[PDB]
Design a protein around this ligand. Structure first.
Ligand SMILES: CC(=O)N[C@@H]1[C@@H](O[C@@H]2O[C@@H](C)[C@@H](O)[C@@H](O)[C@@H]2O)[C@H](O[C@@H]2O[C@H](CO)[C@H](O)[C@H](O)[C@H]2O[C@@H]2O[C@@H](C)[C@@H](O)[C@@H](O)[C@@H]2O)[C@@H](CO)O[C@@H]1O
Ligand SMILES: CC(=O)N[C@@H]1[C@@H](O[C@@H]2O[C@@H](C)[C@@H](O)[C@@H](O)[C@@H]2O)[C@H](O[C@@H]2O[C@H](CO)[C@H](O)[C@H](O)[C@H]2O[C@@H]2O[C@@H](C)[C@@H](O)[C@@H](O)[C@@H]2O)[C@@H](CO)O[C@@H]1O
Lengths: 449, 449
C-alpha cells in the first residue's frame, strides 16, 4: 500500500472536481435598477420578470455541460427571492406571479427534472435588514440561520431536496455595520440538514475564493490551506496558489461572470469564445472548477448572445476532448510495482494508476507508435492519496532533439498544459519536485480545435 | 535615510534592464543543412550565403528598437564563423567571400556604424573539436579561452571594440564527452578585456536562463539567485521565478525565437504580432529583457515576413507608450518624507521617487482628474535600493464600487499589468507584501493599441 500524503479531499470535494463546471445566476432588483450593488431601498414593485422561464435556464445550462447551478436568493440589497417567513422584503410583496412567486422553487423544480445539482447564495451582508447592526447581531445571526433552515430543510428545494453548495459571500461595503457572524452554528445547521454539502466562505470551509473574479487560478495551485490564514484579510496570492503546507483540503473555486458585471446590463456583451477558452485553461486546466455567472435579463430570460456563446463553448470543449492521442501509447520509466505500472497512464482504465518511489527526477517517456499532432497535454494525480507534485516539465522529440513543450508547478486533480502545435511520436513527462512519491492516473494528449 | 535591501544590480545589469530588447542571430552550417543541431561533420563547401548583408541585419534591428545584437560565432557543431587561428574548422575553408570571410567583422562594422551594442555566443559544447574530450579537457579549455581572447581583444570586433554580453550555452547532447569548463578563468579573461561585460552561463554570473525558450518570465520574478542552486541541473522553476532569498543579482534573460527553430527553416513562419505581444507582456512586462532570435536564410538575409513582423511589433510598442494617462494625477497615501512624496509617482521626473515605512497594506490612490480609458498599469521599483515588493493588487472605482483590475507578486525594474478595458478616474495600488519598506519610482497607465 501507498500511504496518504497531506490533507485528503472529501467525497463531495472530489465530486465537484470531477464535475468541473458550475453556473452562477445573479438576478434580482439589481437587474431592474441596472446596477451591481443595491441599497435595500429598491422598490419591490419594480421586480416583475413576466416572461421568466427557470426551466429554460436549467435546460440551456444542462445542454451546455454545467453540472451545478448556484442561485442567488438574496444579494447584498437583502431582497429575498423566495417567500421566506422571516422578512417582508421578499417576492411576496412584488407583482411577479401576483405575489405568489418562489424563484427557488421554480429553479429547484427544473433542476430536479434535469438532475442539475443546486447551490444557494444567501448574502451575509444585508443592507435592508433592521437587524444588521452590531447592537442586534445576535438577532441578525438568528435571521440568517432561520433562512438557512427554510432553504435547506424543504424537500421541494434543491435537486430532489439536496443542495451541493452554500455560498457565503465575504463582500461588505465601506461604512456598513461590522456585524460578526456565528459561522460555526451556521455550519452545524448546514451539516444537520445537508451532510457534507460544500460551503464557500471566508473561513476554513471546503471551498475558498481563488482571490480574483477573472477565472484565474495560480500556478502552483495547492488545493489546501491553513484556516488560520484565511478570513476577510486573507492574502490574494494565498487564495490563488493555496499553501504547500496547508492543513485542510480546500478547493479554490474560480468564479467569473460571462459579462463585465454579475447582473444583466443591456449595454454589456458576453465574453468572446477566445476569452472563455483562456479562462477554461486557467481554471479547469489548473485543477479547479469554473463557476461561470450567466445573468437573466429583465424579462427573466438568458440573453440570446450569452446562450449562443455557451453552446459555442460546449462545442469547443467537446471537440478538444474528441480524441486522446495518447490512448494505448507505450510508456516506459520507473514504476513501484505491476499494480502501479506505467501502462496504467494510457490504458483508458480510470481504475488503474502509476506510482514510483524512484529518486527524482522521474522521467516517463511515451511512444505514440506513429507521429501525431497535438498542442495539449493532460496529467492527473490521485488526490484520494493527497496532492504531491510541485514541479514538472514536458518535452517532445523533434528531429532527434528533445525540445521543450512546457513546464509547470502543480498537477492536482487535472492539469492541462498547452504548448506550440507539434508533430511528434515521443514525449517525456519529467517530475522534478514532489512532496511524496508521485502518483498519476492518466496522461492524455489533445489538439485544440 | 533608506538602507539598501538584498543583492544590488551592477551598472551593466541596470543598463540592460533599461534597454529591454535584444536580438539573437543564429546562422551557420545548420542554415544550409536545414537542422537545429549539427554534428561537426557538415561540409564547409556548403557554407556559402549568396547575398549576405550584415548592414541590413543591423539596420532593421536598429530601426525596430533592438538595443543589442548577440551573434552566434560558433554553435554546437563547432564551425567558427570568423578566421580563428586556433582551428581549421572555420570560414577559412568556406567559399564564402572566397575564403576570406569574417562574419564577426561584417557584423561589428555595421554595429559600430549604427551604435548597436554587441553580444557573442561561443558554444562550450563543441561536437567538432578533437580536443572536446575528458582526456583532453585542459586543451579544450585553452582552445575556448584563446578564442575568447581573439574575440574580445580585437578593436575591430564589437561595437567600437566593446562587447556587452558573452553567451555560454549550457546545452550538450546526451552522448557527448563530459568535459568540465574552467569557468573562473574564462570570466577573469572576460573582465580583463571587457570589464563589466554581462555573462550568460549556467553558473552564478550576471545573466541566467529564464528556464524556458518561450519568452515567459514567472510571477514572481525575483532577479536574484543563490549560485549554489544553479549549474546545469538548476530547477526550471527556480530559474523562472528566481529566489526570494537570492544572494546575487541575476537577470533571468527571456530568450525566444521568432520561429519554431533557432535556425532559419524554409517550411517555418514567424510568430504572429499577437504572439509577440503576449511574449512582450510576459518578459519586458515582468521586469526582464526579451532576447528575440531572428535567423538569416540561406542567402544570408532576414526573411521578408520576419522583417515586416519586427516593424509591426515596433509599431505596437510605440503606440502603447504614446500616452501615459497617469501623468500629473493626484496621488494620496502614506509617504516616508517629503523627499519620498506620493506626488513623485506621476510627476514625469525620473529622479523623484516614493517610499513608505507604514504598516502593510499600503494603499496609494490616484485621481486622474477626469475619466480616462486604460487596460495597462505600469509600476517600477528602484532597484538601486534592491528588489522588495512580493505582492500587490490594483483596484478601480466603477459606479461607486471598488473593483479589481488585477494582482501580482513582484514588480522589479518594470511591471506591466493588463486588465479589462475600463473607464475610470480613481485607481488604487495596494502593496500587501514586501521584503523591506517599499519604493516605487513611477506609476503609469496605458491603453493597448
Ligand atoms: C460588484 C462587484 O464586483 N463586487 C466585488 C465583490 O464581489 C462579490 O462577489 C461577486 C460574486 C458578486 O456577488 C458581487 O456582487 C459581490 O459583491 C468582491 O468581493 C469578493 O467576492 C468574492 C467572490 O468573488 C468573495 O465573496 C470574497 O470574500 C469577497 O471579498 C471580500 O470583500 C471585499 C469587499 C473585500 O473586503 C475583500 O478583502 C473580502 O475578501 C470584492 C473583492 O475585493 O470586489 C467587489 O466588491
Ligand atoms: C534545438 C533546441 O531547441 N535546443 C534546446 C537547447 O537550446 C539551446 O539554446 C538555444 C538558444 C539554441 O542555441 C539551441 O541550439 C541550444 O541547444 C536547450 O538548452 C538550454 O538552452 C538555454 C538557452 O535557451 C541555456 O543555454 C540552458 O543552459 C540550456 O539547457 C541546458 O542543457 C540542456 C540540454 C539541459 O541539460 C538543461 O537542463 C541545461 O540547463 C535545451 C533545454 O533543455 O533544450 C534543447 O536541447
Amino acid at each position: 500500500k501507498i500511504k496518504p500524503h497531506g490533507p485528503l479531499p472529501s467525497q463531495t470535494q472530489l465530486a465537484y472536481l470531477g464535475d468541473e463546471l458550475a453556473a452562477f445566476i445573479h438576478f434580482g432588483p439589481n437587474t431592474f435598477y441596472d446596477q451591481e450593488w443595491g441599497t435595500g431601498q429598491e422598490d419591490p414593485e419594480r421586480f416583475n420578470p413576466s416572461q421568466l422561464d427557470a426551466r429554460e435556464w436549467v435546460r440551456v445550462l444542462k445542454e451546455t455541460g454545467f453540472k451545478k447551478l448556484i442561485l442567488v436568493v438574496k444579494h447584498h440589497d437583502g431582497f429575498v427571492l423566495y417567500p421566506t417567513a422571516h422578512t417582508d422584503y421578499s417576492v411576496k410583496v412584488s407583482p411577479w406571479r401576483r405575489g405568489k412567486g418562489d424563484l427557488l422553487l421554480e429553479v429547484s423544480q427544473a433542476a430536479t427534472e434535469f438532475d442539475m445539482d443546486m447551490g444557494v447564495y444567501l448574502s451575509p451582508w444585508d443592507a435592508h435588514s433592521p437587524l444588521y447592526h452590531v447592537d442586534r447581531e445576535a438577532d441578525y445571526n438568528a435571521y440568517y440561520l432561520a433562512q438557512l433552515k427554510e432553504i435547506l430543510s424543504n424537500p421541494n428545494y434543491g435537486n430532489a431536496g439536496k443542495f451541493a453548495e452554500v455560498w457565503m459571500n465575504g463582500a461588505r461595503g465601506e461604512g456598513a455595520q461590522k456585524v460578526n457572524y456565528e459561522f460555526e452554528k451556521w455550519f452545524e445547521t448546514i451539516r444537520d440538514l445537508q451532510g457534507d454539502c460544500l460551503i464557500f466562505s471566508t473561513e476554513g470551509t471546503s471551498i475558498r475564493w481563488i482571490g480574483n473574479q477573472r477565472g484565474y487560478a495560480g500556478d502552483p495551485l495547492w488545493q489546501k490551506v491553513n484556516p488560520d490564514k484565511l478570513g476577510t484579510e486573507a492574502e490574494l496570492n494565498y487564495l490563488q496558489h493555496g499553501d504547500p503546507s496547508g492543513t485542510i483540503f480546500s478547493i479554490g473555486e474560480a468564479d467569473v461572470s460571462i459579462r463585465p458585471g454579475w447582473f444583466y446590463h443591456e449595454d454589456q456583451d458576453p465574453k468572446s469564445l477566445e476569452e472563455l477558452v483562456e479562462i477554461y485553461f486557467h481554471s479547469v486546466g489548473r485543477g479547479t472548477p469554473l463557476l461561470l455567472n450567466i445573468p437573466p435579463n429583465q424579462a427573466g430570460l438568458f440573453d440570446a448572445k450569452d446562450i449562443e456563446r455557451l453552446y459555442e463553448f460546449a462545442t469547443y470543449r467537446n471537440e478538444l476532448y474528441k480524441e486522446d492521442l495518447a490512448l494505448g501509447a507505450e510508456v516506459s520509466g520507473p514504476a513501484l510495482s505491476a499494480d502501479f505500472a506505467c501502462r496504467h497512464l494510457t490504458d483508458g482504465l480510470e481504475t488503474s494508476s502509476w506510482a514510483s518511489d524512484a529518486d527524482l527526477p522521474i522521467q516517463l517517456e511515451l511512444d505514440l507508435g506513429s507521429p501525431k499532432t497535438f498542442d495539449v497535454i493532460e496529467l492527473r494525480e490521485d488526490l484520494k492519496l493527497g496532492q504531491r507534485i510541485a514541479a514538472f516539465h514536458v518535452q517532445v522529440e523533434v528531429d532527434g532533439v528533445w525540445q521543450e513543450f512546457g513546464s509547470g508547478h502543480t498537477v492536482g486533480y487535472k492539469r492541462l498544459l498547452r504548448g506550440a502545435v507539434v508533430e511528434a511520436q515521443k514525449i517525456r513527462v519529467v517530475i522534478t519536485e514532489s512532496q511524496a512519491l508521485p502518483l498519476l492516473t492518466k496522461i492524455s494528449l489533445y489538439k485544440t480545435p
